[PDB]
Design an enzyme around this catalytic site. Structure first.
Site, short mmCIF file in Angstrom:
data_model
loop_
_atom_site.label_atom_id
_atom_site.label_comp_id
_atom_site.label_asym_id
_atom_site.label_seq_id
_atom_site.Cartn_x
_atom_site.Cartn_y
_atom_site.Cartn_z
CG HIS A 253 -5.70 -2.54 1.08
ND1 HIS A 253 -4.95 -2.40 -0.06
CD2 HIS A 253 -5.23 -1.61 1.95
CE1 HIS A 253 -4.04 -1.45 0.12
NE2 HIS A 253 -4.19 -0.96 1.33
CG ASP B 117 -4.03 -4.06 -3.04
OD1 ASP B 117 -4.31 -3.92 -4.25
OD2 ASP B 117 -4.91 -4.32 -2.19
CB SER C 214 -1.03 -0.08 1.13
OG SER C 214 -2.08 0.84 0.90
C1 LIG Z 1 -10.83 3.12 9.54
C2 LIG Z 1 -9.81 4.24 9.51
N1 LIG Z 1 -9.41 4.65 8.14
C3 LIG Z 1 -8.75 5.96 8.04
C4 LIG Z 1 -7.34 6.00 8.54
C5 LIG Z 1 -9.00 3.64 7.16
C6 LIG Z 1 -7.91 2.70 7.65
N2 LIG Z 1 -7.52 1.70 6.64
C7 LIG Z 1 -8.35 0.50 6.61
C8 LIG Z 1 -8.23 -0.43 7.83
C9 LIG Z 1 -6.93 -1.16 8.25
C10 LIG Z 1 -8.04 -1.73 9.18
C11 LIG Z 1 -8.02 -2.56 10.46
C12 LIG Z 1 -6.82 -2.83 11.12
C13 LIG Z 1 -6.81 -3.52 12.32
C14 LIG Z 1 -7.99 -3.96 12.90
C15 LIG Z 1 -7.98 -4.70 14.20
F1 LIG Z 1 -8.99 -4.36 14.99
F2 LIG Z 1 -8.07 -6.03 14.03
F3 LIG Z 1 -6.87 -4.49 14.92
C16 LIG Z 1 -9.19 -3.70 12.24
C17 LIG Z 1 -9.20 -3.01 11.04
C18 LIG Z 1 -8.54 -0.27 9.33
C19 LIG Z 1 -8.94 -1.81 7.91
C20 LIG Z 1 -6.46 1.99 5.85
O1 LIG Z 1 -5.83 3.03 5.97
C21 LIG Z 1 -6.04 0.96 4.80
N3 LIG Z 1 -4.70 1.26 4.31
C22 LIG Z 1 -3.58 0.66 4.85
S1 LIG Z 1 -3.87 -0.51 6.11
C23 LIG Z 1 -2.20 -1.08 6.57
C24 LIG Z 1 -2.33 -1.71 7.93
C25 LIG Z 1 -2.41 -0.92 9.07
C26 LIG Z 1 -2.62 -1.47 10.32
C27 LIG Z 1 -2.75 -2.83 10.41
F4 LIG Z 1 -2.98 -3.39 11.63
C28 LIG Z 1 -2.67 -3.66 9.32
C29 LIG Z 1 -2.45 -3.09 8.08
N4 LIG Z 1 -2.35 0.96 4.53
C30 LIG Z 1 -2.12 1.94 3.59
O2 LIG Z 1 -0.96 2.27 3.32
C31 LIG Z 1 -3.26 2.61 2.96
C32 LIG Z 1 -4.50 2.20 3.31
C33 LIG Z 1 -5.58 2.94 2.58
C34 LIG Z 1 -4.81 3.81 1.59
C35 LIG Z 1 -3.32 3.71 1.93
CL LIG Z 2 -10.32 -3.92 -0.02
#
Ligand SMILES: CCN(CC)CCN(C[C@]12C[C@](c3ccc(C(F)(F)F)cc3)(C1)C2)C(=O)Cn1c(SCc2ccc(F)cc2)nc(=O)c2c1C=CC2
Ligand SMILES: [Cl-]
Ligand SMILES: [Cl-]
EC number: 3.1.1.47
Length: 370
Positions: free
Chosen positions: A297, A242, A219
């Site tokens: 993702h 991704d 990402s």
């Molecule tokens: C909802 C808040 N919102 C705005 C900031 C969107 C946040 N989001 C989607 C999420 C990750 C999600 C997640 C984690 C962890 C639990 C848990 F509860 F299990 F711990 C649940 C639910 C929350 C699904 C993303 O940002 C996705 N994303 C990512 S996620 C990388 C990641 C981060 C933390 C992790 F633990 C695992 C993986 N890396 C990027 O570089 C980019 C994007 C979007 C474009 C650029």
């Molecule tokens: Cl997705």
């Protein structure tokens, strides 16, 4: 929960911070191990990472304590501080995490690469894109273990373009700096690990195949791969998992001479992002792209293995495809691409078909119309 590697070698893990400052390198190392009787590696090793995750998810700090209760004792199948498997030069992968992640959340990828004979350096970025990270303000603080924590920066809509680009540039510099540190350690440079751990860095002397270097990332880390390739020719090829292309400046698109492989999820991608990936293409450059059917993702990160199917599908951590099946495809296709463009003398070419998306759970190129 998090799968063991599919390769023939046992896997070890340790952490390296050098220097101790916010400008130093911080990374988690996965490597082929001599032994397989050590304690497993703690997955998320400090309470502050959970507080960081709560801020990233948009909830109150108390939800951090709940996440800690649920996931704070979980391990990943790597032998913590085990000796390096001697007698062979290993190729090197530098790995870049996504927005809101940190160094330890891509162990499924790290462990599998290490099990096939790679050393993997998973960087922890200090650009405020990590949910949390830490360092030491000065030499005194490092001695006593007084950690200073740095948490994720939330951006105003107006800051998006400029700050994300500053961040991807810093990320690229952090990837280059990590490579320079590992290569120096390979050439016998004495380094005092700021973390006091029972793993002697002298073992890594003459352990790296110095020309077989790749950069991989998820990402925000996928954009980091592309930025890094454009500014550091020591990286021979890159794999973007991704990739989120938004942070990249207009100038980088035409200056990526190295081979580049895009591995996408079915449900994350969109036209604007795919168009940016297509701008990296040129008749003289080697480019590949595949899409994993039914994947989301989060299939590239470790949280896809941390819960059951029902809770996983609800939290967007799992897709229609099985998580182990999805990661196996990404990992095996990555190995084939790495063998081809690093010139490895292994049997990873058995997965060459996966580079062309020739599999029932793969789509050649992309499902997105542009
Ligand atoms: C909802 C808040 N919102 C705005 C900031 C969107 C946040 N989001 C989607 C999420 C990750 C999600 C997640 C984690 C962890 C639990 C848990 F509860 F299990 F711990 C649940 C639910 C929350 C699904 C993303 O940002 C996705 N994303 C990512 S996620 C990388 C990641 C981060 C933390 C992790 F633990 C695992 C993986 N890396 C990027 O570089 C980019 C994007 C979007 C474009 C650029
Ligand atoms: Cl997705
Ligand atoms: Cl779009």
């Amino acid at each position: 929960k998090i799968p063991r590697g599919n390769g023939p070698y046992s896997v070890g893990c340790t952490d390296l911070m050098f220097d101790h400052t916010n400008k130093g390198t911080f990374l988690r190392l996965y490597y082929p191990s001599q032994d397989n009787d050590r304690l497993d590696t703690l997955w998320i090793p400090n309470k502050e990472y959970f507080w960081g995750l709560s801020k990233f998810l948009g909830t109150h700090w108390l939800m951090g304590n709940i996440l800690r209760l649920l996931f704070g004792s979980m391990t990943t199948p790597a032998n913590w501080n085990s000796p390096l498997r001697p007698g062979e030069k290993y190729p090197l992968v530098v790995f870049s995490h996504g927005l809101g992640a940190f160094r330890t959340l891509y162990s499924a990828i790290g462990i599998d690469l290490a099990s096939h004979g790679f050393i993997v350096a998973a960087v922890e970025h200090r650009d405020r894109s990590a949910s949390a990270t830490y360092y030491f303000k000065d030499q005194s603080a490092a001695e006593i273990g007084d950690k200073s924590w740095l948490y994720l920066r939330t951006l105003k809509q107006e800051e998006e373009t400029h700050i994300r680009n500053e961040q991807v540039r810093q990320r690229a510099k952090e990837c280059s700096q990590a490579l320079s540190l590992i290569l120096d350690i390979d050439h016998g440079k004495p380094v005092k690990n700021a973390l006091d751990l029972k793993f002697d860095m002298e073992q890594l002397k003459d352990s790296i195949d110095r020309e077989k270097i790749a950069v991989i990332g998820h990402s925000f880390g996928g954009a980091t791969v592309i930025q890094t390739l454009s500014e550091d020719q020591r990286f021979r090829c890159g794999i973007a998992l991704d990739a989120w292309m938004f942070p990249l400046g207009d100038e980088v698109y035409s200056r990526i001479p190295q081979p580049l492989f895009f591995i996408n999820s079915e449900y994350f991608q969109y036209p604007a992002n795919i168009i940016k990936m297509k701008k990296c293409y040129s008749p003289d450059k080697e480019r590949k792209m595949i899409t994993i059917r039914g994947s989301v993702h989060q299939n590239f990160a470790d949280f896809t293995f941390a819960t059951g199917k029902i809770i996983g599908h609800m939290l967007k951590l799992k897709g229609d495809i099985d998580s182990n099946v999805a990661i196996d495809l990404s990992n095996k296709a990555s190995l084939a691409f790495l063998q081809k463009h690093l010139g490895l003398h292994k049997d990873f070419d058995q997965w060459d078909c996966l580079i062309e998306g020739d599999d029932e759970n793969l789509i050649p190129g992309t499902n997105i119309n542009t």
